[PDB]
């Protein structure tokens, strides 16, 4: 009643506060600040449940509705680009503050066990939370064409502006916020369409609510509204040459999620559109060149896990892995970025191209891999180097297994002596060399993160052995002794360019039963002994399945009213021991399967070597006896 009905006065005041930019931005900031709870950034949604109960209003929805209507329609009356950028940034921040304040796991567990197991008392609380929280309205607005059009217009800008702009420029911050909102929407679209739409529809059908739809029924998902924009990927790729770590990581994650989808790649390749869009003015070439220049940039030894360069490298590697693992038979953008001529159900190399001159992304990866040393002195056997090489080897294996990109890759590898570089980069493992300053025999080893690096190193050795065996089989079937001599010399322990290297029998040091990975010390467990891991269990024992059971048991014991305060610490320490027991069992299973895979790879390599061997046997009798001596204790 601002001094005329309230439904009219409120909209009149909102429209009055919409004229201009200063007052609009100030109101948006005020609303964003008010939406923050007093405890800071989970229940008790930050607003009174009786907000607007007197008048026939939907609560706090009108505010978000007006904000979205403004951001969608009145963005053309702003001449000053700075004001428009500030308004878009404020709207994106408001949307993010509204989305981040939504419970996902809570609603999932509710819809799962509340009505099916728990009573019907708390159901009303979750219902009111889902009905009053503005997340549903934001998601509904996200399916509008105006919103995505404004977003892609804001993200589509000239490169000169971003180049001459400052890292703290509002344009970069707005683009980052928009990418984050898009990521959150792509993550929560399924949860929404599953546990919001039906409940809201049922409530609207039962009770009396007057709401105006703002979503498009045709857009069954968020990808339907964005699959019509081809310049988005081009802009995301061009924005990688700016140097901004956060923006680069966001763009890489967005491209990875896009390549991971299915409808987008079904619409693109039902000839194709992306390959021709990225080959308009040589965008792929410059993108590959920028990626190569980036991965070649060194890292900061002190800021191992904080070096933005290493983070960008890992993001690019994850993107390539996800793009190659998805739909390997049909080519993708990864093949074009590597320097291949992506043709319909066929690949090829062009003359004088970047991949022909051995200057491309794949060759850059090969170089940075062969010029990488993991053997250190101060710590020795670092972890992040191991992770990097493991990712590189996974990408190489994904490229090799694909028969569409196997022959050319094997040719390019054998034409540069990659196996020789790998062997020269090999390092022997012993129980004395610690992992990141920590010894293996220590009990904390199974609890520390060194297990991941150990599994990665085992997988790397297995992949190297498999590649060596495949190359040996190829050279044998090709009936050419020009390379067989060098292969045997490398296996004999000599190199003629003589440089010596440890033989294959030297690397047979990963089979050791002294650690007793199978045996586990079982504590007394005077209580909770009957709690098994039935619902916990692909050997993967979930911890929540036992956490809920032990919590229910503790609640029952407390309700029994028999020395509940004293014996609580016993149950607490038993749970703290059981969680580490489960983690140790999982790590032991992982180590066991890794050792099994490595042993299988080594056995296959040895079989391929023994079978395809025309060299005399009397000289190799020494190696035969050595292998027999080495396997004797293993069999025993």
């Amino acid at each position: 009643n601002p001094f005329p009905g309230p439904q009219e006065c409120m909209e009149m005041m909102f429209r009055e506060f919409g004229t201009g930019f200063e007052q609009s931005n100030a109101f948006i900031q005020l609303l964003t600040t008010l939406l923050v709870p007093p405890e800071g950034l989970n229940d008790s949604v930050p607003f009174p449940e009786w907000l607007g109960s007197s008048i026939r209003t939907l609560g706090i929805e009108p505010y978000v509705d007006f904000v979205f209507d403004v951001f969608a329609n009145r963005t053309k009356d702003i001449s000053d680009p700075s004001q428009l950028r500030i308004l878009r940034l404020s709207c994106l921040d408001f949307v993010m503050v509204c989305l981040v304040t939504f419970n996902e796991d809570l609603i999932v567990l509710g819809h799962e066990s509340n009505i099916s197991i728990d009573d019907a008392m708390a159901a009303t609380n979750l219902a009111t939370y889902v009905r009053l929280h503005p997340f549903s309205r934001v998601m509904e607005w996200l399916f509008n064409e105006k919103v995505i059009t404004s977003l892609i217009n804001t993200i589509h800008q000239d490169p000169i502006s971003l180049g001459s702009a400052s890292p703290d420029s509002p344009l970069v911050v707005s683009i980052l916020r928009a990418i984050q909102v898009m990521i959150k929407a792509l993550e929560l679209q399924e949860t929404y369409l599953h546990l919001v739409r039906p409940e809201v529809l049922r409530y609207q059908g039962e009770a009396g609510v007057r709401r105006k739809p703002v979503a498009n029924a045709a857009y069954s998902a968020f990808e339907d509204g964005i699959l019509s924009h081809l310049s988005l990927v081009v802009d995301l790729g061009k924005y990688c040459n700016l140097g901004h770590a956060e923006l680069t990581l966001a763009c890489l994650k967005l491209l990875e999620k896009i390549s991971t989808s299915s409808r987008i790649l079904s619409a693109w390749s039902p000839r194709n559109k992306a390959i021709v869009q990225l080959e308009r003015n040589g965008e792929g070439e410059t993108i590959s060149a920028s990626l190569s220049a980036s991965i070649m940039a060194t890292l900061d030894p002190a800021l191992a896990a904080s070096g933005e360069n290493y983070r960008v490298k890992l993001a690019i590697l994850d993107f390539l892995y996800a793009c190659l693992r998805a739909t390997p038979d049909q080519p993708t953008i990864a093949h074009q970025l590597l320097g291949f001529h992506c043709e319909l159900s066929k690949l090829g190399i062009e003359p004088k191209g970047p991949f022909d001159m051995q200057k491309s992304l794949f060759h850059s990866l090969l170089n940075v891999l062969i010029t990488l040393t993991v053997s250190e002195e101060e710590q020795g056997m670092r972890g992040y180097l191991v992770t990097l090489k493991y990712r590189v080897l996974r990408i190489l294996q994904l490229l090799w297994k694909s028969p569409l990109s196997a022959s050319l890759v094997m040719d390019e590898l054998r034409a540069t002596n990659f196996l020789f570089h790998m062997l020269l980069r090999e390092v022997q493992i012993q129980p004395q060399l610690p992992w990141d300053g920590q010894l293996v025999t220590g009990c904390e080893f199974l609890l520390s993160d060194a297990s991941l690096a150990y599994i990665d190193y085992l997988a790397s050795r297995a992949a190297i052995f498999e590649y060596i065996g495949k190359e040996l089989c190829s050279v044998s079937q090709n009936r050419i002794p020009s390379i067989k001599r060098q292969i045997f010399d490398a296996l004999n322990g000599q190199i003629f360019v003589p440089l010596t290297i440890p033989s294959i029998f030297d690397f047979f040091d990963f089979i050791n039963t002294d650690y007793k990975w199978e045996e586990i010390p079982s504590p007394h467990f005077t209580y909770l002994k009957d709690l098994d891991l039935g619902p916990c269990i692909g050997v993967h024992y979930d911890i929540r399945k036992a956490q809920e059971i032990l919590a229910l048991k503790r609640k029952e014991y407390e309700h029994s009213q028999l020395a509940t305060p004293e014996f609580l610490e016993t149950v607490e320490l038993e749970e703290k021991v059981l969680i580490e027991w489960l983690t140790v069992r999982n790590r032991a299973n992982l180590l066991l399967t890794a050792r099994l895979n490595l042993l299988q790879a080594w056995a296959n390599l040895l079989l391929v070597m023994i079978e395809s061997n025309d060299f005399k046997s009397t000289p190799k009798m020494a190696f035969l006896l050595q292998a027999l001596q080495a396997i004797l204790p293993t069999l025993e």
């Binding site: 051995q358 540069t416 002596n417 020789f420 020269l424 190199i495 360019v497």
Partner: peptide, 9 residues
């Protein structure tokens, strides 16, 4: 063609 890929330590 192989400026640095050579095995010349």
């Amino acid at each position: 063609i192989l400026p640095m890929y050579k095995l010349s330590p």
